[PDB]
Amino acid sequence: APADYFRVLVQQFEVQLQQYRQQIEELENHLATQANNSHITPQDLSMAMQKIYQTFVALAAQLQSIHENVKVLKEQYLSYRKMFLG
Amino acid sequence: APADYFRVLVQQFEVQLQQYRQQIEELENHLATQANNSHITPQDLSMAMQKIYQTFVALAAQLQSIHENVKVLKEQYLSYRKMFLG
Amino acid sequence: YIDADLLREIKQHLKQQQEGLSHLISIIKDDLEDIK
Amino acid sequence: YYIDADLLREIKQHLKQQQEGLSHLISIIKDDLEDIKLV
Amino acid sequence: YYIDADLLREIKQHLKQQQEGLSHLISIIKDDLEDIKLV
Amino acid sequence: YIDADLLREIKQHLKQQQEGLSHLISIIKDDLEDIK
C-alpha cells in the first residue's frame, strides 16, 4: 500500500530533520562563547562541519524529491480533473 | 618530528572522544524521560545507536593502538636501560 | 566484550516499533519551525 | 583556547547559506501545495 | 509516543557494555603506564 | 546556493589552527572522566 511507502519517505525525512537539528544546535552551543569553545578543538569543529554538511546534502535531497513527489500529485490530480470534471 | 606525529594521534583520539561524548549525552537526554522521548522517533534512536556504535568502534581502535604505542615506549625504554644502566 | 545478538535485537525491536503519521508530521512541523 | 573572530564569521556564513538553501526548497514545496489548492 | 520499558533496558545494557569495553582498554593502558614507572 | 570556496577556506583555516598539547590533554582527561 502507498501508505507504507509514504510513511517511509516521510520517516527518513524526519530523521534527517532531527539529525540536522541536533547537530546544528550542538554546533551553535560550541560557538556560543569562548568559554564553551575552549572545551572543543579546531579539529572537532572541522569534524562537525563535515557531519553537518553531510546531513544538509541528504536533507536537501529529501526536500528535492518531496518537491518532485508533489509535482506528481498535481499532474495526476489535474489529469483526473480533466477526465471527470471538465 | 615525532611531536608532529604524536600531536596527530592524540588529536584524532580527542575528536573521537568528543564525538562519542556528545552523542552519548545526546542519547541520554532523549531517553531521560517519555516527555523528551516523544520528540523523537524509534527510527531516530535507531540512527543514533548506529552513529554511536561507529564512534565506539573507532574509539576502541584508538585506545588499542595507544596501548600498542605504550608497549613500544616500554620496550625501547627497557632496551636503553639494559644498554646504559645494567 | 560486545553482545552482537543484543544490538541486533535492539535494531529489530525499533524497526518493528511503528510510526503514528499524525505524530510524525507534528515532529517534522516543529523541526522545520525550530530552524528555517 | 578558541578560534579567529573571523573564522567564526566564515562558519556562521556557511551555516546561513545552508539555511537559505533548505528554506528555498521548502518555499518551492509550499508554492506547489498552494498552487494545488488553486488549480 | 515512546518505546518499550524493556527496549529501553536493552539499549541501556548495550551502552553499558560499550562503556565497560572502553574502560577495560583504559585499564590496560593504565597498567602499562604504571608498570613503566615500576620497571 | 552553497559557496564551495568558503567551506574549503573554513577547512584550510581550522587545519592551520594549532593544538596546544597541554590544552589537548586537559580536554581528553575531562572527557575520559565525564564518561568512564
Next chain:
Amino acid sequence: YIDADLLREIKQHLKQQQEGLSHLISIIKDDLEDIK
C-alpha cells in the same frame, strides 16, 4: 680479477642475516664498558 657478483652476494647475505636485540644490547653494553 675480482668477482663483483660474489661481493654483492656477500653483502645481500649479511644484510639478510638478522639481529637478536637481546644479543645486540649485550654487545653494546660490553662495548661501552670496555671503554668509558
